[PDB]
Amino acid sequence: SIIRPQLKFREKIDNSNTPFLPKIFIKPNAQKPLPQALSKERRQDMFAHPYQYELNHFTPADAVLQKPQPQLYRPIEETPCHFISSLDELVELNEKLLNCQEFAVNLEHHSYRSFLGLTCLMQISTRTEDFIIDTLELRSDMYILNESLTDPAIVKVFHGADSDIEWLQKDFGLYVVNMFDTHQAARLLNLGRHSLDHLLKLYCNVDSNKQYQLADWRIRPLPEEMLSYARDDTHYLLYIYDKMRLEMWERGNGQPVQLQVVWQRSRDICLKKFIKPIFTDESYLELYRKQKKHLNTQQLTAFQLLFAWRDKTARREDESYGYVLPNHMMLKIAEELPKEPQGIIACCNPVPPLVRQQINEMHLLIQQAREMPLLKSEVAA
Numbered sequence: 001s002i003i004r005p006q007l008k009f010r011e012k013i014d015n016s017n018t019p020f021l022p023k024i025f026i027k028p029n030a031q032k033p034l035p036q037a038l039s040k041e042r043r044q045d046m047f048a049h050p051y052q053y054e055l056n057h058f059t060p061a062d063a064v065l066q067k068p069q070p071q072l073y074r075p076i077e078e079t080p081c082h083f084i085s086s087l088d089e090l091v092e093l094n095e096k097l098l099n100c101q102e103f104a105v106n107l108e109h110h111s112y113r114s115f116l117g118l119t120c121l122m123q124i125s126t127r128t129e130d131f132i133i134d135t136l137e138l139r140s141d142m143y144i145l146n147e148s149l150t151d152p153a154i155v156k157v158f159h160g161a162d163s164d165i166e167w168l169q170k171d172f173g174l175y176v177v178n179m180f181d182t183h184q185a186a187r188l189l190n191l192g193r194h195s196l197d198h199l200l201k202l203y204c205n206v207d208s209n210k211q212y213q214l215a216d217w218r219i220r221p222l223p224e225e226m227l228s229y230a231r232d233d234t235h236y237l238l239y240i241y242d243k244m245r246l247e248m249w250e251r252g253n254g255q256p257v258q259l260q261v262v263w264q265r266s267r268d269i270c271l272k273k274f275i276k277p278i279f280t281d282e283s284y285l286e287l288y289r290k291q292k293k294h295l296n297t298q299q300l301t302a303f304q305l306l307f308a309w310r311d312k313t314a315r316r317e318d319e320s321y322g323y324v325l326p327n328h329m330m331l332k333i334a335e336e337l338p339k340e341p342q343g344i345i346a347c348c349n350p351v352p353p354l355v356r357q358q359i360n361e362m363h364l365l366i367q368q369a370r371e372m373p374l375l376k377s378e379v380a381a
């Protein structure tokens, strides 16, 4: 069993209906001052995208828009690998990155034992080295990387950064400026169809392991098989970045028409803001209504309170819905309207721990539901 990494976090995570307030408190590479309300002290819209201005006013430099001379990825077995877990080490890396023409980025996320989700690892590759950053440990010191991630001079290469852009700002208050999504280029080369794993074959004839796409990245220590799985996802990314600019150049008949599009599409992805979610029972009750489930006043109520009891527990304990109580079990309980606490436990296969732990709290809820007055049509029927 793994101990929840959120416990050692210095600042508790907010899982309240409150609207997400960007965590950035010092804005490097700024063109528009960062709202005073966000300064480290006071802790002109506050809920705006910190790098909104710089992003809208960004265009790739001529240097990159010109036909590339692909630089082969360094042989993986000759490429040094660095494990970063201390601020001092993170600060040294950021310093090296600041002297780069461009570098690759990718994150490992987790969501089963977390309400909103949690970023457990960050992978960065330069033309010659590979780095693995422990974003659990350095969670509160990650922001320092904003110096290079928002440096328009350096080009950050990702592959489908859609969610990565949202976890970076939601977890570390980090943002990106000057990004090239290889998945966006891929769409312009009839490849937007396949993943990076496939692009690693077509472009570098490298076999990919997919045993870890859903593994537990909160684990520590990270075994070699996982460290390798992770690095491989940023190591050959710069090469593919050059190769794709080369191919998009030999298509626009000697022009940066397509290149600018990728950069533009990518810049938009970077402009996405994170928004805390909200879930309502109305959604399910709508599906269960089409599946001719026919839930009576009592069942509907039992489901309504269970859905409510779950959202509350998931936010307090900082767990996912699927951990606290998966739908089908919730829906089952709502139907059976179990008279005893033990009756509830029967509907669960298996029985989630927070349910056994609150078995009584839940019992009182079902109980309440069973006291609800049935409509006439539901008594006879």
Ligand SMILES: [Y+3]
Residues within 6 Å of the ligand: 196, 197, 208, 209, 229, 232, 233
């Ligand atoms: Y992979």
Ligand SMILES: [Y+3]
Residues within 6 Å of the ligand: 280, 281, 282
């Ligand atoms: Y409702």
